[PDB]
Design a protein around this ligand. Structure first.
Ligand SMILES: Nc1nc2c(ncn2[C@@H]2O[C@H](COP(=O)(O)OP(=O)(O)OP(=O)(O)O)[C@@H](O)[C@H]2O)c(=O)[nH]1
Ligand SMILES: Nc1nc2c(ncn2[C@@H]2O[C@H](COP(=O)(O)OP(=O)(O)OP(=O)(O)O)[C@@H](O)[C@H]2O)c(=O)[nH]1
Ligand SMILES: Nc1nc2c(ncn2[C@@H]2O[C@H](COP(=O)(O)OP(=O)(O)O)[C@@H](O)[C@H]2O)c(=O)[nH]1
Ligand SMILES: [Mg+2]
Ligand SMILES: [Mg+2]
Ligand SMILES: [Zn+2]
Lengths: 90, 52, 48, 50, 48, 82, 52, 39, 429, 439, 439
């Protein structure tokens, strides 16, 4: 709150009018964040959340692929494991 | 006469001597240089006698 | 619902090119100058 | 052609100076109006002192 | 001479020469060009 | 920005003082009254020589604060607006 | 930030006159005629119109 | 707004780089010309 | 070929009053309406703007729209106020209150019945109607809201007519309301799909024309509106008078609009010079071209050097020659080709009319589809975003019944139009 | 058409209306008695007077205004004054007992039994009017009937007249000087109605008006008469756009919607210039730029609050006289550069302009010099929170000990009303601060 | 264009400004009423008065001046004097109590209750000038107001107007003639403003003017009126280049750049010749060479400092009348030839010349005599360090045992202010000697 912000921004020598200015700025930034989050559903496009969706999907797919093997990909990896020899000798 | 074929300095619009002309873009003719120097109209006050 | 006797006033604009025998060139609109207008008071012309 | 150009130029110049005359007349009318306003203000000053 | 060309030795314009619309070398100025309507509806009007 | 900031009762509650103008035992239109009522009159940038991202001011413009202290309960935390 | 000039040193000329009385319609020479009936250019004729 | 961009290209230089010298064989709208060289 | 004029709002009615001033002067019509022409030509195409009355006089085909009867009364008391037909004046008890919502949904909705009655009445009286010319201001309430309502709802009845709109745009420097972004955005995302062509005038540029060129000490709205009235007349000079190379509104739209959304134009007028400076300058087409392509002669407060020209049109008036008039256009295109779009060859369409404006040997009206027109749209869209982000001045528009999504729709359409104006500006071949 | 019904509440409102009418009659050519000259069939050739006066069944002009006072001294003075025949015998509502500087008395006991009669007179005025633009209320929040009865009248006007504009001009307690002890209570309680049941409220504090007269009009001992003359000049400047020909017409709805960003934020600070004495006037070239600078300067301010301590949100400048767009736009451009004045980030435009060709008029015996041009600002700015902070801090001091609350209880109001008034003023300061905050 | 604002501080400033403004009015044919009745020689609407007089709607020519003094004696007598109509009732503002030759009192206590209004009036004056050249501040540092309030005004003007020109016509305590006893304290304490916020500080001490007038004008009894008339003549000679036409026109910054070699080496002595009596004048042929030599002599100089003890750094000559540039060229040649005056080695040219067509205007009833040509020299030279090295010696003698320091420290000024001013002045003599030293 107000007292908490004044305690947090305890900078000596600095003008305490400027202290009130900064505390007001933080408090109203928090209030504006709350107000904007109440109605951001309509304003924010769906494409914005796509980045976070992709990050979560990549993490989940990594966690799943860390365990499950596939024989169809096993044939592919048997085809692989020699082209890498080709690359290192080349 | 801001740019001139008369002088040595090329004050012409950038790459006007090899501009987008009917002689080179989809067409192509050996008359490309002749047609650029012939259709550079406002730099023809002197060479053309002022005609288009 | 005003007076029925009253009529639409006539507003005389002092200097107009048509009245002065001059063309209506750009910058020659001296009749639209408020000082050249007889009365600055505004009437209800349509309702009268 | 040259005669027509010169004729238009002379007539335009005459009309331009007539326009300048009427513009200066209205400017002088405004100047006289604010002179009279200043005189009114001065008279009101003496009246307020009185 | 051209308008931009030198008029130093250009022929002087005679005093009797008329440099107006009526002396423009046009069909209306051509002497044996019979512009008045001899035959037609406009001729019938002119005959009234 | 120190002029942008409003001189709200919230400001006085957090700062210490009241929007009530200071009542000073002074003759009207005097230097003593002006120093008692305005904070731009007694402003002084620093103390002595500096030896014994630059410095900026803008807090001395306003009025001196009253002797009373604004209780928090008289102040609203939120206000209805958009 | 805008240049201004006094009327005393910026005004049209009073030293030029033609002694011609003309309505603004007749002011501009040939200003009510086309290029098919009158292709060429020539001045008008008004009261007091002389060679200039 | 940068007046220079977009930069006007050189069609002569573009043809020289692309090798756009001609079609001696001829196309649907072109002509089999023996005079043209390097294509 | 018939053009029906509609003047919306205070600004629109004043501009129309002075437009009918200049048109009556050009067609030899006195304030009482009687014809005092000096040749056949004035009467031969007087039907274009004037419907013939009974006793040999003429009545303008103009519809005056204003929820405030004040500007109505000022127009009527004007020197040519008696020229207009009485029932063509339409007004209400209370004004729009500088609100687009009030002018477009609540206060302008009752009078729109009579306004459409009058416009339709003036529609069949035309042998072959060419279009509707509406003059209004985007920042107002009645001129913006009610005017754009008329623009939107006349296209449905008359899709094949040219819809020409003189929009007097706002400017932050010229801000004389506080809801300019809201009003002009609500007007523009309607004019985009409901106007065949929309030319924009900025009061900043009008003031600057008075400052630089006219050098008038005290120029009022009369002198200010003469500048735009001259161009309004010079667009249809080719309609009203014969010329060597004729054009109409449809031909102007065809030669000026490459893509239908891009139909916003910035205009200029020539010749323009202070009275004392007219002696040093010779009046010819060579000087007229320089005056057009001089940016200080624009009625748009945007610099043509800050964009490219999609298209341009010069409606020349006055007796001239067709050779050097095209020579000037070729020269300017070639030597400012960095400011003309390459893939649109010969960006400038020049039309020639024989009859010049009264008192001028030769004049011209410039209509340019410059890509710099995106500058105003981007600036006022940024202002609109700043106001709508913190929900400023919404309650006036919202309590009139309007939805929150309308402003977002307008913002999207504005950013979209700026997007074409940029992506065709920087486009390659 | 374009009528605007004027309302005067309390002694302050009634005297301000008297000084407004001595100006309106003189400006529109109506005699103080109201009748026409005997030889003339019609007193005034035009109907520019229509907005303030309605012609009668004898040809003479009765004003489109109501006076309203719970005590009979001021209204009886109006009856016995030089305008005894101009004003209607009705529309001059008088009570037999005042409100005694008590909002509860003016709102709940004495006000309720006279407010309906006042609304009957107002309804007759509105029926007479055919193009009513709105209501033009004048009063003082520091009085009994001015605050409580004015509040009740505004509430009834809001419920009965729809969304019709209700402009208000109210005299607030001064930061320094006051003529009452319960004035903070009255102002705090009146801010309820003035915060919900009015469109735009105008600060008219007597301390700043006195300072204006002293420093500029050179009146060493000014009075309520001079103060009300200045107020009438401001009101005439605001209203003259619909009465006289002008470049940029501005109406009541126009400048009430171009002024307020939020329904709660509608309290505006107003200034008028060039306010100069006759001796001052012929010494200065009162140009458009000079008068604009004087208006934006706190010296020309009519409210004892410094706008430099807040942020401007919407300024409506009404220019009168020989002003020109050649100069007003230049003055605006050069005043936006000045950094004492400063706008909220969410309102970049922030300016409305209304130009009228009619210069201000001169009242006999008045101290206003004849000026070729004038300009009045109606400015909504966040700096107005200062006076609210001061007034409700005085309210808190007076309310901690429950002082003078017994008078309000005896005149019929709950103490919860005091509590809610204080809470709503605190909320008003909070959202003033919020809208002053940046994005 | 070319406007210049004159600010007079203290009694000495007001006394100087009275003579300056009467002489300006006589230059421009402006009566104390402030009008131009009829002048055949004056062209139609000719404006060479724009630098010092601003046109008014009343046709008046209001001076661009601001008179200040903390007590109303001189202010009131000017307000009731001859130029009541010429001078605005404002722009001529006064306090109520004098500074009493207390720099601390005039800079911290009594100066601050009027400096705000001083800045307001200066801003009002500057808003009317579209080509403001700069500010000329006339004061004597030996007093209370002129030192303290003058320093405060200069410090505030520096931040209010940026890099605009400041020309401080300052009357230092002369080596022998000096009124006050705390005058050395005031002069030393006011050194920071003159070092930093004044772009060029011109010397106008009284003893040198007294010697000049007694030896050259041949009047046994001149007065403050006479010395102020001479000072006004000097100021008019300086401003004639930007007022009237001339062969070589020089502006404030034009001679600032040529006269100030180093950031604070800007304290410059003044001289003027031919100063001549009525009987003296019409018997001599005052050649340009003769008047230039009289200027460079140390007896026709307005500052009591002998140039032979220092190095000349840069001399700016202002010639008025029928002077041909060859005469001044020969004067420069013979000045460089003659040895008893020596220029500093690193400044070869060291000379600026400005010729103005209009000759000086005699003031009958005063003391001067009509002369066909005149010249005023403003000289930056290292010899000016002597007056500083004398005033600081007096300051040290006075301050060794804390004499007269309680008055200063009781007005809200720290004790260290005296030490800071003394150290700054000492650095002034130090770098004067440094720049005077040969390479
Ligand atoms: N500007 C101005 N303010 C006035 C005037 N008369 C009274 N006031 C203000 O009103 C306050 C006094 O209370 P009133 O408004 O007279 O009270 P009231 O409206 O008559 O209501 P009651 O107190 O019940 O009689 C003073 O503090 C003034 O600020 C006036 O003539 N002009
Ligand atoms: N040249 C000139 N100097 C003057 C004149 N009057 C006063 N002085 C100077 O003023 C000095 C005395 O300072 P003060 O008597 O305090 O006057 P002040 O500097 O204006 O300061 P205060 O009057 O105390 O407010 C003297 O040494 C003079 O040099 C004058 O008329 N002409
Ligand atoms: N050029 C010009 N513009 C005007 C005139 N009057 C108003 N405007 C413009 O119109 C805009 C405001 O329109 P407004 O009067 O509110 O229209 P309304 O609400 O429909 O009556 C402003 O931005 C002005 O710049 C005028 O006489 N001439
Ligand atoms: Mg009372
Ligand atoms: Mg003194
Ligand atoms: Zn308090």
């Amino acid at each position: 709150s107000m007292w908490a912000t004044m305690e947090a921004l305890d900078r000596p020598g600095m003008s305490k009018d400027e202290l009130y200015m900064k505390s007001l700025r933080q408090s109203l930034r928090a209030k504006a964040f709350l107000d904007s989050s109440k109605n951001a559903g309509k304003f924010i496009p769906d494409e914005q959340l796509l980045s976070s969706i992709k990050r979560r999907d990549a993490k989940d797919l990594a966690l799943t692929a860390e365990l499950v093997p596939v024989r169809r990909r096993d044939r592919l990896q048997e085809l692989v494991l020699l082209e890498n020899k080709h690359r290192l000798r080349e | 006469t801001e740019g001139r074929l008369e002088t040595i300095h090329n004050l012409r619009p950038k790459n006007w001597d090899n501009r987008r002309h009917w002689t080179n873009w989809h067409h192509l003719y050996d008359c490309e240089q002749d047609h650029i120097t012939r259709e550079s109209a406002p730099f023809h006050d002197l060479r053309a006698g002022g005609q288009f | 619902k005003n007076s029925v006797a009253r009529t639409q006033p006539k507003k005389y604009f002092a200097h107009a090119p048509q009245s002065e025998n001059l063309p209506l060139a750009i910058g020659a609109d001296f009749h639209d100058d408020p000082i050249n207008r007889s009365t600055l008071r505004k009437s209800h012309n349509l309702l009268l | 052609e040259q005669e027509r150009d010169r004729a238009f130029d002379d007539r335009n110049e005459e009309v331009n100076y007539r326009l300048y005359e009427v513009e200066q007349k209205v400017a002088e009318q405004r100047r006289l109006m604010e002179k009279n306003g200043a005189d009114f203000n001065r008279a009101l000053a003496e009246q307020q002192r009185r | 001479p051209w308008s931009t060309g030198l008029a130093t030795s250009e022929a002087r314009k005679g005093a009797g020469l008329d440099l107006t619309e009526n002396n423009l070398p046009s069909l209306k100025t051509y002497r044996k060009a019979n512009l008045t309507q001899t035959i037609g509806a406009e001729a019938a009007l002119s005959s009234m | 920005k120190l002029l942008t900031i409003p001189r709200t009762n919230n400001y006085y509650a957090a700062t210490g003082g009241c929007p009530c103008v200071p009542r000073v035992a002074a003759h009207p239109g005097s230097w003593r009254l002006k120093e008692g009522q305005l904070r731009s009159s007694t402003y002084r940038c620093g103390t002595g020589c500096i030896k014994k991202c630059c410095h900026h001011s803008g807090d001395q413009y306003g009025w001196r604060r009253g002797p009373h202290t604004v209780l928090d309960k008289n102040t609203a935390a939120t206000g209805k607006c958009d | 930030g805008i240049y201004t000039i006094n009327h005393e040193y910026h005004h049209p000329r009073e030293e030029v006159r033609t002694g011609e009385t003309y309505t603004p319609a007749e002011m501009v020479p040939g200003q009510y005629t086309t290029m098919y009936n009158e292709p060429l250019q020539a001045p008008n004729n008004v009261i007091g119109s002389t060679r200039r | 707004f940068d007046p220079e961009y977009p930069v006007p290209v050189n069609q002569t230089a573009l043809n020289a780089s692309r090798g756009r010298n001609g079609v001696p064989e001829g196309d649907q709208y072109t002509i089999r010309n023996n005079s043209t060289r390097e294509g | 070929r018939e053009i029906v004029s509609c003047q919306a709002g205070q600004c629109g009615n004043q501009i129309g009053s002075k437009f009918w001033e200049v048109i009556s002067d050009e067609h030899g019509v006195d304030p009482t309406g009687t014809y005092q022409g000096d040749s056949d030509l004035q009467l031969e195409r007087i039907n274009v703007y004037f419907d013939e009355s009974s006793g040999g006089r003429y009545v303008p085909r103009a519809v005056l729209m204003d929820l405030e009867p004040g500007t109505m009364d000022s127009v009527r008391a004007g020197p040519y106020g008696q020229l207009f037909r009485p029932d063509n004046f339409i007004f209400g008890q209370s004004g729009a209150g500088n609100n687009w919502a009030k002018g477009h949904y609540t206060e302008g909705a009752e009078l729109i019945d009579s306004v459409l009655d009058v416009c339709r009445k003036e529609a069949e009286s035309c042998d072959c109607l060419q279009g509707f010319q509406l003059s209004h201001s985007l920042g107002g309430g009645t001129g913006s809201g009610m005017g754009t309502l008329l623009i939107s709802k006349l296209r449905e009845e008359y899709p094949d007519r040219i819809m020409m709109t003189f929009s007097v745009i706002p400017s932050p420097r010229v801000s004389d309301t506080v809801v300019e972004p809201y009003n002009t955005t609500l007007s523009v995302h309607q004019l985009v799909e409901n106007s065949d062509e929309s030319m924009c005038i900025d009061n900043e540029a009008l003031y600057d024309i008075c400052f630089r060129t006219l050098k008038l000490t005290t120029p009022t709205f009369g002198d200010l509106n003469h500048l735009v009235a001259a161009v309004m007349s010079g667009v249809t000079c080719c309609l009203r008078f014969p010329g060597q190379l004729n054009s109409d509104l449809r031909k102007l739209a065809v030669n000026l609009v490459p893509f239908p959304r891009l139909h916003f134009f910035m205009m200029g007028f020539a010749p323009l010079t202070s009275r004392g400076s007219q002696q040093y300058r010779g009046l010819s087409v060579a000087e007229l071209t320089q005056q057009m392509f001089d940016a200080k002669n624009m009625m748009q407060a945007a610099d043509p050097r800050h964009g490219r020209y999609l298209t341009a049109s010069a409606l020349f008036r006055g007796r001239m020659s067709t050779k050097e008039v095209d020579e000037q256009m070729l020269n300017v295109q070639n030597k400012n080709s960095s400011y003309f779009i390459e893939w649109i060859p010969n960006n400038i369409k020049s039309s020639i009319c024989d009859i010049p404006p009264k008192g001028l040997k030769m004049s011209v009206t410039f209509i340019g589809n410059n890509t710099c027109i995106q500058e105003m749209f981007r600036r006022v869209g940024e202002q609109f975003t700043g106001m709508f982000r913190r929900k400023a001045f919404l309650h006036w528009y919202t309590g009139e019944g309007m939805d929150e999504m309308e402003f977002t729709e307008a913002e999207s359409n504005m950013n979209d139009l700026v997007s074409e104006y940029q992506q065709y500006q920087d486009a390659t071949v | 058409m374009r009528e605007a019904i004027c309302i005067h509440i309390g002694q302050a409102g009634c005297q301000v209306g008297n000084a407004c009418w001595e100006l309106f009659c003189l400006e529109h050519g109506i005699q103080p008695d109201g009748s026409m000259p005997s030889d003339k069939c019609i007193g005034v050739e035009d109907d520019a007077f229509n907005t303030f006066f309605s012609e009668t069944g004898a040809g003479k002009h009765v004003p489109r205004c109501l006076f309203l006072d719970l005590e009979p001294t001021v209204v009886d003075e109006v009856r016995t004054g030089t305008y005894r025949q101009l004003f209607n015998p009705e529309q001059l509502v008088s009570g037999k007992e005042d409100a005694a500087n008590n909002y509860a008395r003016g709102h709940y006991t004495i006000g309720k039994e006279i407010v309906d009669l006042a609304l009957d007179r107002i309804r007759k005025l509105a029926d007479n009017c055919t193009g009513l633009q709105g209501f033009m209320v004048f009063h003082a929040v520091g009085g009994g009937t001015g605050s409580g009865l004015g509040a009740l009248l505004l509430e009834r006007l809001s419920v009965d007249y729809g969304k019709k504009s209700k402009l208000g001009y109210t005299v607030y307690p001064s930061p320094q000087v006051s003529t009452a002890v319960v004035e903070p209570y009255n102002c705090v309680l009146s801010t309820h109605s003035l915060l919900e049941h009015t469109d735009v409220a105008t600060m008219l504090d007597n301390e700043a008006i006195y300072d204006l007269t002293r420093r500029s009009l050179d009146i060493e001992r000014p009075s309520y008469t001079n103060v009300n003359r200045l107020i009438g000049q401001v009101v005439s400047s605001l209203t003259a756009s619909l009465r006289f020909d002008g470049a940029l017409n501005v109406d009541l709805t126009e400048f009430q919607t171009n002024l307020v960003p939020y329904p709660r934020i509608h309290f505006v600070l107003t200034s008028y210039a060039p306010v100069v004495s006759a001796e001052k006037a012929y010494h200065e070239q009162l140009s458009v730029a000079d008068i604009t600078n004087s208006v934006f300067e706190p010296a020309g301010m009519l409210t004892k609050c410094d706008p430099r301590h807040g942020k401007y949100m919407s300024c409506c400048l009404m220019y009168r006289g020989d002003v020109v767009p050649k100069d007003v736009n230049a003055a605006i451009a050069t005043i936006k550069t000045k950094r004492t004045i400063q706008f909220v980030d969410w309102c970049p435009t922030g300016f409305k302009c209304g130009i009228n060709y009619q210069p201000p008029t001169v009242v006999p015996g008045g101290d206003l010099a004849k000026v070729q041009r004038a300009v009045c600002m109606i400015a909504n700015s966040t700096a107005i929170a200062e006076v609210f902070a001061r007034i409700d801090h005085k309210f808190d001091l007076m309310y901690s000990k429950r002082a003078f609350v017994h008078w309000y209880v005896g005149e019929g109001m709950e103490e919860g009303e005091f509590s809610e008034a204080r809470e709503d003023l605190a909320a008003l300061e909070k959202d003033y601060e919020e809208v002053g905050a940046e994005s």
